[PDB]
Write an enzyme that holds these catalytic residues in place. Sequence first.
Site, mmCIF file in Angstrom:
data_model
loop_
_atom_site.group_PDB
_atom_site.id
_atom_site.type_symbol
_atom_site.label_atom_id
_atom_site.label_comp_id
_atom_site.label_asym_id
_atom_site.label_seq_id
_atom_site.Cartn_x
_atom_site.Cartn_y
_atom_site.Cartn_z
ATOM 1 N N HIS A 90 -10.685 23.193 -20.740
ATOM 2 C CA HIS A 90 -9.353 23.873 -21.493
ATOM 3 C C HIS A 90 -9.914 25.273 -21.818
ATOM 4 O O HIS A 90 -9.114 26.050 -21.458
ATOM 5 C CB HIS A 90 -8.910 23.076 -22.391
ATOM 6 C CG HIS A 90 -7.495 23.526 -23.162
ATOM 7 N ND1 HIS A 90 -6.478 23.232 -22.605
ATOM 8 C CD2 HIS A 90 -7.267 24.170 -24.148
ATOM 9 C CE1 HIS A 90 -5.667 23.576 -23.340
ATOM 10 N NE2 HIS A 90 -6.143 24.201 -24.458
ATOM 11 N N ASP A 132 -8.100 22.647 -33.531
ATOM 12 C CA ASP A 132 -7.276 23.530 -32.468
ATOM 13 C C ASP A 132 -6.584 24.777 -33.301
ATOM 14 O O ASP A 132 -5.672 24.699 -34.143
ATOM 15 C CB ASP A 132 -5.946 22.425 -32.453
ATOM 16 C CG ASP A 132 -5.200 22.773 -31.372
ATOM 17 O OD1 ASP A 132 -4.850 23.802 -31.014
ATOM 18 O OD2 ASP A 132 -4.439 21.650 -30.504
HETATM 19 C C1 HEM Z 1 -1.803 19.169 -25.476
HETATM 20 C C2 HEM Z 1 -1.557 20.350 -25.609
HETATM 21 C C3 HEM Z 1 -2.962 21.142 -25.923
HETATM 22 C C4 HEM Z 1 -4.120 20.787 -26.627
HETATM 23 C C5 HEM Z 1 -4.457 19.295 -27.136
HETATM 24 C C6 HEM Z 1 -5.050 21.959 -26.899
HETATM 25 C C7 HEM Z 1 -6.157 21.984 -27.571
HETATM 26 C C8 HEM Z 1 -6.964 23.075 -27.687
HETATM 27 C C9 HEM Z 1 -8.260 23.042 -28.500
HETATM 28 C C10 HEM Z 1 -8.849 21.888 -29.097
HETATM 29 C C11 HEM Z 1 -8.777 24.145 -28.194
HETATM 30 C C12 HEM Z 1 -10.050 24.733 -28.957
HETATM 31 C C13 HEM Z 1 -10.260 25.358 -30.088
HETATM 32 C C14 HEM Z 1 -9.186 26.689 -30.082
HETATM 33 O O1 HEM Z 1 -9.756 27.885 -30.146
HETATM 34 O O2 HEM Z 1 -8.158 26.647 -30.344
HETATM 35 C C15 HEM Z 1 -7.826 25.234 -27.625
HETATM 36 C C16 HEM Z 1 -8.072 26.457 -27.139
HETATM 37 C C17 HEM Z 1 -7.154 27.017 -26.449
HETATM 38 N N1 HEM Z 1 -5.689 26.710 -26.030
HETATM 39 FE FE1 HEM Z 1 -5.184 24.922 -26.171
HETATM 40 N N2 HEM Z 1 -4.251 23.057 -26.541
HETATM 41 C C18 HEM Z 1 -3.052 22.694 -25.758
HETATM 42 C C19 HEM Z 1 -2.251 23.416 -25.030
HETATM 43 C C20 HEM Z 1 -2.475 24.702 -24.672
HETATM 44 C C21 HEM Z 1 -1.771 25.515 -23.806
HETATM 45 C C22 HEM Z 1 -0.273 25.064 -23.109
HETATM 46 C C23 HEM Z 1 -1.977 26.750 -23.681
HETATM 47 C C24 HEM Z 1 -1.578 27.897 -22.912
HETATM 48 C C25 HEM Z 1 -0.289 28.247 -22.593
HETATM 49 C C26 HEM Z 1 -3.317 26.766 -24.450
HETATM 50 C C27 HEM Z 1 -4.046 27.982 -24.746
HETATM 51 C C28 HEM Z 1 -5.233 27.909 -25.442
HETATM 52 C C29 HEM Z 1 -5.956 29.279 -25.653
HETATM 53 C C30 HEM Z 1 -5.922 30.383 -25.253
HETATM 54 C C31 HEM Z 1 -7.604 28.634 -26.169
HETATM 55 C C32 HEM Z 1 -8.527 29.482 -26.867
HETATM 56 C C33 HEM Z 1 -9.415 29.595 -25.570
HETATM 57 C C34 HEM Z 1 -10.480 30.434 -25.837
HETATM 58 O O3 HEM Z 1 -10.401 31.651 -25.601
HETATM 59 O O4 HEM Z 1 -11.694 30.021 -26.111
HETATM 60 N N3 HEM Z 1 -3.507 25.422 -25.173
HETATM 61 N N4 HEM Z 1 -6.820 24.296 -27.078
#
Ligand code: HEM
Lengths: 311, 311, 311, 311, 311, 311
Positions: free
Chosen positions: D222, D149
């Site tokens: 996501h 993450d």
């Molecule tokens: C329970 C809450 C969340 C979980 C478990 C979660 C988990 C993850 C995971 C596993 C990834 C893929 C690895 C990474 O590139 O970081 C990811 C990507 C991402 N997450 Fe989350 N996330 C959560 C909440 C959020 C929220 C609330 C936002 C936006 C307001 C967000 C924005 C992003 C963004 C911008 C990426 C990168 C996407 C990309 O360009 O490849 N996440 N998240």
Amino acid sequence: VARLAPQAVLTPPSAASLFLVLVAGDSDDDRATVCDVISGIDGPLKAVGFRELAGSLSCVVGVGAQFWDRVSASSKPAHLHPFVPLSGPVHSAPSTPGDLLFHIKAARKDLCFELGRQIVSALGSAATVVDEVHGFRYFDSRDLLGFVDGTENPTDDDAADSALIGDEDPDFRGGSYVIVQKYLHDMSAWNTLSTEEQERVIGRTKLENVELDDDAQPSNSHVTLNTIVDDDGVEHDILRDNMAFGSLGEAEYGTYFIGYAKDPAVTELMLRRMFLGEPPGNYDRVLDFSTAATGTLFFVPSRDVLESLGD
Amino acid sequence: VARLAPQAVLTPPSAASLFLVLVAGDSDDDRATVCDVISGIDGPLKAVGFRELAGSLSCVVGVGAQFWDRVSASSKPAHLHPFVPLSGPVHSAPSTPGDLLFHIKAARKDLCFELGRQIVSALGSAATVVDEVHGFRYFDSRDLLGFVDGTENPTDDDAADSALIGDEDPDFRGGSYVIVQKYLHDMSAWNTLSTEEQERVIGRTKLENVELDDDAQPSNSHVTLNTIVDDDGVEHDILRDNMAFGSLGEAEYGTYFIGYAKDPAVTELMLRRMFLGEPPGNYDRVLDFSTAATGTLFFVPSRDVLESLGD
Amino acid sequence: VARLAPQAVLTPPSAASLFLVLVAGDSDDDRATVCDVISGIDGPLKAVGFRELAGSLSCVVGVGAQFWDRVSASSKPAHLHPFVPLSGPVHSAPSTPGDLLFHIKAARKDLCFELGRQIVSALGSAATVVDEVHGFRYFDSRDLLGFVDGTENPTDDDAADSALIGDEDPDFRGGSYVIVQKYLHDMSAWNTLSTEEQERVIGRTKLENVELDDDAQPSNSHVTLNTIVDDDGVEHDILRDNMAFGSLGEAEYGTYFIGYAKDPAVTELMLRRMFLGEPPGNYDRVLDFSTAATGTLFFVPSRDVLESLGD
Amino acid sequence: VARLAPQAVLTPPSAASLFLVLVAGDSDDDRATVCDVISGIDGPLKAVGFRELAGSLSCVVGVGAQFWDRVSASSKPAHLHPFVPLSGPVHSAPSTPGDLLFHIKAARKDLCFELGRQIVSALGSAATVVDEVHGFRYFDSRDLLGFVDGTENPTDDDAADSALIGDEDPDFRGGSYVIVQKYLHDMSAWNTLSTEEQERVIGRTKLENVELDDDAQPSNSHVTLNTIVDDDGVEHDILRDNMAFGSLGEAEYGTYFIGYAKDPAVTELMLRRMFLGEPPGNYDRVLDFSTAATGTLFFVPSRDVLESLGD
Amino acid sequence: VARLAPQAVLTPPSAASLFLVLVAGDSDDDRATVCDVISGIDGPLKAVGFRELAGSLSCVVGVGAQFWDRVSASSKPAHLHPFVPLSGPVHSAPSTPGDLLFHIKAARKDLCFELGRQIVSALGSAATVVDEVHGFRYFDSRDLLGFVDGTENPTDDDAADSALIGDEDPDFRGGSYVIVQKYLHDMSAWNTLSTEEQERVIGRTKLENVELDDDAQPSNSHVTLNTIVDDDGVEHDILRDNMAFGSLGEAEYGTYFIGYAKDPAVTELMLRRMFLGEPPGNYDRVLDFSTAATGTLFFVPSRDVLESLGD
Amino acid sequence: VARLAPQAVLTPPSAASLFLVLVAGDSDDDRATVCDVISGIDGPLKAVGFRELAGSLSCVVGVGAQFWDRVSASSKPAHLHPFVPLSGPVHSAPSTPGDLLFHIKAARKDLCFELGRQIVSALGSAATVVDEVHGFRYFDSRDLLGFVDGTENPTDDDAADSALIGDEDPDFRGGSYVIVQKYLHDMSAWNTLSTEEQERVIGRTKLENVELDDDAQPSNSHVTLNTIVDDDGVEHDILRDNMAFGSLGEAEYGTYFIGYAKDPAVTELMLRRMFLGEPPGNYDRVLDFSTAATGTLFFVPSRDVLESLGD
Ligand code: HEM
Ligand code: HEM
Ligand code: HEM
Ligand code: HEM
């Protein structure tokens, strides 16, 4: 942070240090040898420092005003002069000899000692060590008085702005002015005081390292006397890198003071407030437990200026 | 490896050490103070050492033969006597004063220095420091002659068998006998030699730390003279914990020798072979570059025996 | 030190811990599930702990007297009984529920949390968490009162002798008895005291962690009341592994007490001296700043006995 | 990377964190106290952080729109407003209270906890904690759903360009906008899914952390919903610093979301795509296993602007 | 854990390893050279290993049955014989040459490589390398199939009891029997399977490394086939130290298997169950993705027996 | 230092590296696949590197002149051409194939190997590995000839000035030119020489890594021949990142040379002086012990240019 670069003033605190102060011989040959060694100091710095993967080894060379005049008679930083001795109502800050300073730092003592060995070898008969301290970090960044020492140092851009010469003396941009003083403590007198009395001497709480409240902060605490406020309300910092040292068999418990500033006027005003007092007589209580054995001012040239020396 | 246990002789090499040698005052009160401090040495050892999560701090207390006779007149280890001075054809090993030894080791200098501070404070006027060395590790386990130093030490059960008293003196089981000698080097003379000449002086290759072949190994190399073979062909080891020390401004480049053995006959025979030579005159070439300034023998009591002292 | 072995009581302090206390369900199925999980606790311990090269993860399982009687009705350690509550003149030590204890330690919080997760998952509806604390190391081995906490713990063979059942109860050799108490501090009341007043409450100096002199040591200091001397002058230790915990938004500043002993008579006598006082009324001043929210005693079976449970 | 500098948004991931959200009291005195503490936050940051040689401790202060209007009525960042709540077809993102955020990070929990303690102490009755999470790193940069993450975070200049206000709002250059949401997971529902079903929910492979192929990437993953592409084909990033938290006894398994952006329009569009869906209804599957308990937006002033607050 | 001691079988997993297998020349001179080098293997082990403060370097020497008979014709461990090849219904375990094994481990590759260099140099023309693998740790103790590999190893006394010869063959007490097999994987075939299919092949969950429930555990999983239960219900373990290796340009993705046991009957029964199947035909699914290129059995003498070789 | 940023040429030395050289297939589809993978190389770099908290993983992509012309026919760096082979009087530097270079570095081998695995997987049939070396650090920054290797590298701004294209080719600002050569050593011939003979071959002392005095420095030492001085007396550096590699069973002891420069004219002049000699015939003595098996030149695009490839 710089890697294996001479004249890296802005480096963070380290676990080990070496402070070497030398006097140069009077002959033209001795002057030439000294200039050869210091202008090429990147050689030994890399020869030793490259052997540690982390590259923690740093070396800052300072040059005294008198030696500067021997080697660069027609071009001089604006505020380079010998350390001005202070004679306070109770305590004094002597001015003691030194033409060259090497302020060496690393994660390990061996790196500091080996770089010092190589420098002293290279200088040979052209210079004589007059002070030598192998400093060590003591617990969680404390000095031997048991207080965290360095807390309010400027960091990053604030450190650059406080320590390095800028537009005001452009021929020497990127240089600094450094003062050293080797202090020895009266530990038996200090450890007579209660913790709260010691906190009032320093101006911060002891275990927790928190500045005393305004209504609890004495006018002669170390913190108050070393706070420098100009008429516009702007504060002026120096960059300090103190280290502990000592000998149990000589009952020598020391703090080696080293302070860098873009203009020695700041460091000198701190010293006046400490030794002479503000108002006059209201001197720094730290000096009732700490005696300065040395006092020497050096110019720290930028790398470009250092490389040019002897030409 | 033991944790925060006094008299832990078998500890591995460390990054920092402190070797303190003291003489005890002549009075009954001074004797009692010394016995109180050393018998309860677990107090300061834990007071300092528990503050580091790794618990690297160790402290071994040695007691000289003369002081031993003052405090334990009716019970004495079989081979406790003052260091026997040697007068070789060229070099000598002096016997110099010492009633108490503290051999302190840790991962950091501050822990060693603070434990030493607390011990010296507790002893007060009852003892006087006569030698003090703050040792440091130098590169990859090297001494200042540039050789890896400690390679052939026994480890684990071999170390216990070599260093600790067993069935042969059961009242003192678990104790040891330790000899210290502070050596200063003639670095300019040493660094005249070629690498291969230095390898022949030591008996191992320099960078690679490999023992010389049998047909290349001189009869007066350090390795040959310090190899002890009995009539049954059994070898006898000591356990060494040497450390570097020095002062650049005094041109002092030192190796602090410390060697533990279950019977000082082994260490003493090594010293005779080194200083007197085998055959007589064929002395250790290391001594042409290294001068012993001190020489002192101590008994290291087991914890049980140490705790009993002064009772 | 043991590697990935259940019931490793003698492990050194760690950076992170988890203390879980659970009550078991009343049904035969719940009893069987609990016995299955705890007797096979090496499974989850290795499943999590093997993932860290250093193998720092440890897990000690304790079993309460009442649950013990449900599962091993015909064979019981000599001194297993529920925690005896104390009602002192001012402060009380409650006896609070708990059938199972998991005392988990590691270099990292994730390892502790993940092992706890796997254990709670495996137990499912068969047990209910009644207390949970994620402990952390605070600076140089300090508790939230700002004192180094654990200094005088026994180590190595002394720790084994103090903590583990021996010849006196041979069917349970290698087991231990553990008491937990979760304490919450009145930090505003504590930080009213001067440093010297706090040192008199504890019995040691604060920054330096040195036991007070005999002529300065109060009769109701924590150190005095927790020193246990028998009629033969022999001292008796327990093995403690306290950790800090808390919540800034609840103004909860905690010390989690955990103490192991080969016979709970030692720990119980310490608690009586603390809460009831010696002489009666002369109770431990630490309790004027620290309130016990829980109090529970568990038997820690040896690995062999643990593996047998439920059979 | 900055050293002991307030408002260091660009710091890399850490092993420990503390997220504190507070509401300020309604009185002028409370407003003044809050401004005094936050404008001088470098004091406590250095008081705690200087004690660790590595200087890993960081502290970012955020200020809510409503409190901002109380203290800086005539000058406001262009896009500062309270968090806009979302009501999706299935899941909702609430807007919950908060005037102040402290986002604290370090290599160790004690440093985070102690800085939080000192800040809460200094604020006293002038503010009330309304949310508090002590975050921890979980294995190889994973969240409690078992996925790495943070992978696609921008770094270095990309991070500065994505997170920090520039020429578009020059009075606030170097500030940022941060949104927090505390999420709790339904672990039993999640761990019903196969690994491949979970990979389709996230948009990356689980153990190996590789983005799914274009022809395997769901429109409601996501990753897809949080990819922001403008009409020119330029991508827009936010800078996230999520951490795990939880309580085994409450079956609370959490991800604390924190996201910085130079313009909250980016973060808000991500949230709309997640909660409302793109096309409408096609919402983020992560929300079927994760419930937001909080939602709060803060302005992060540059150091210069922060220092000015309350003047 | 042992320090710089040959034949240290019980050492924990390391970051780097070297597995060398050699054939000895046929001449008496070659036999004598081999015996000289291996009986004195403590020399090179200390020459290299002492240079690292941590002393992580270990070296276990194994001797094949045929070479054993050349050098110790009148005294032989009870169960020493060449590896017995297996011909399963689908997969085979070949028996491939080897007279000498060096199993070298350390925290760093350079230490392993340098010790191997010194050993190969010392052997010269007397032996020929027939297999060489430089192993590396892969993430959180995983093999290249992506599973944590080593979880259920015995540790501490269980490891000693499982790996080292005891009362049953007292002339060889403290020795062991080791089998090596170099496996190459079909990664494209493996990564066709779903995670759950792979978990059924191994017998544990993939990310979380938890053994499958009894009602989910296949009869031909690796875990089931490698679980050895005697008629009394007692389990028998081996001690494994597998490491990853490979070449991207050869599409070579390898697991180097190494397993120690006090009696090769245990390891051999595991291999029969894996390759032949239990019941016959029900072979280990890991072998559908993993091909053994080597198979060799060695006796690991105790240090005392090793030192005696060639006499 | 950059974090998880492709094309980070200025990174400090690491403990592990991977050098991959590939040839691209001739088809349009193969060209497109290669451009897709390399232009998006930040994906795999983050997928692997984010899993390590320290973020030590780096990846620099180089593109050969011939492949460059296939993909960017209308825009080319000023000095991109295939490696020019040298035929010296004794030794030769061959020009060997390569369209793509991946220079990968990290604190651990697994990170390098896994990133290489993911890149090779993504390229599939579109490219073929033609050289692969897994480099390792050897003791205190030494090569297998036993000399510290990298000492005089430029660092910080000097490194940027030496390695990165600037105003002279503004369309390619921030790119570099890199040459690789895989060298194999004749260790038996080398270790015939005395230490002093080896020091004269290299131009520095061996253990101490100090440049030889001017009056001791041979005209054909490696240091002399690789010192590049222009007519104005200005020196020109390259940035090297050599690593050790080898196979004990093939008697392969290697140094992998990799050198970055803003203009390959500097690196090419060094190579001419080494192989052809200055004066002609006076070639580098290192080549009497070191044979180049490969020689390939690549352009290292800036991140912006790399991201654009294939468009
Ligand atoms: C329970 C809450 C969340 C979980 C478990 C979660 C988990 C993850 C995971 C596993 C990834 C893929 C690895 C990474 O590139 O970081 C990811 C990507 C991402 N997450 Fe989350 N996330 C959560 C909440 C959020 C929220 C609330 C936002 C936006 C307001 C967000 C924005 C992003 C963004 C911008 C990426 C990168 C996407 C990309 O360009 O490849 N996440 N998240
Ligand atoms: C025996 C010698 C000295 C001792 C034991 C000592 C100790 C300390 C301590 C414990 C602090 C508080 C923590 C901190 O912010 O660093 C401090 C602050 C400081 N000291 Fe010293 N010091 C010594 C000499 C000096 C000298 C000679 C100078 C000036 C020439 C100096 C300048 C300062 C300054 C500028 C501060 C920061 C004050 C602030 O702005 O809060 N010190 N020193
Ligand atoms: C200036 C003082 C000394 C120096 C520089 C020195 C240096 C060395 C070196 C470089 C080695 C080889 C590596 C090793 O196995 O440790 C060595 C070995 C050894 N030294 Fe010393 N040493 C000194 C004093 C002594 C003394 C005074 C003794 C005996 C009383 C001694 C006893 C030994 C022994 C027993 C060995 C191992 C020989 C073997 O069995 O291979 N050393 N020393
Ligand atoms: C077998 C191959 C090589 C070996 C063993 C080797 C070894 C060394 C060593 C031991 C040093 C001295 C320490 C240092 O400053 O790095 C050095 C310096 C240097 N080498 Fe090499 N090198 C090799 C190939 C090359 C090649 C092919 C080049 C140029 C294309 C090169 C360029 C340099 C440069 C520029 C220096 C610094 C000279 C100075 O300014 O002091 N090396 N090398």
